[model samples]
Target: TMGNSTVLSFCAFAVDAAKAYKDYLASGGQPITNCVKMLCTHTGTGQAITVTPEANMDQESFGGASCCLYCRCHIDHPNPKGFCDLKGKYVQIPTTCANDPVGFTLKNTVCTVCGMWKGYGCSC
Candidate 1:
């Protein structure tokens, strides 16, 4: 499949996803910092193969006011790493495997299913 290179397939998917994201943002969309369950192509038949694109756009404000002095709102929370920590799942996996995460971000329609945040931690 994909000329014997899954990585190549993934690159195609990444490009498509990046373009999609750009369009989304251009059309008044916000960053996707959550683990969302997206149904995409993965094959390399050149006819839209089923694929999974992994992309996260979490946010962090190092120079922002706190939620409150007592509460001590931290930039650590609501950040990309925190978002993944709050949710424990990933959107991509082998088709043979089953089940998807059930977590969502405050963005309402975004996915926060990834359980792995860089090399800091993991919940998978």
Candidate 2:
């Protein structure tokens, strides 16, 4: 049972996910540069608690669900270190991990899942 400090509960979940991403950029929106430091501990008091929230809002809301250049063209075929490089056997996400793109861009948003381009490299 964790009665002590679990790193102060991951610094209060990163100060409540940076004050809810600065109140969603002061209600104007279009903010959230990748921040997901979630924490879920069973806690027998063994220790080690890490949390970092704001959750990067890719699944909830923040500009049609983080849709910038269609979320960097679905994160450039999972190449932007946003992770998720699939090739086959995706019978609806059966692989263990790293299939990271399901939303936030893809399924033909004019390609850009973190590829970053319009005039040069890294378009993946």
lDDT of each: 0.26, 0.26
lDDT (Cα, tens digit) per residue for candidate 1, span 18-106? 34334544566433322234443333221111122432232211100111111121223334554332222223232221121111121
Mind giving the per-residue lDDT tens digits that candidate 2 earns over 1-124?
A: 2221332233234534334333444556443243222232222211111121111212121222222222322323234564332221111111121122222222323225442212221244
TM-score of each: 0.18, 0.15
Error of 2 at 18 (Å): 6.6
Candidate 2 Cα outliers beyond 4 Å, as residue runs: 1-13, 33-124
Measure candidate 2: CA RMSD. 17.7
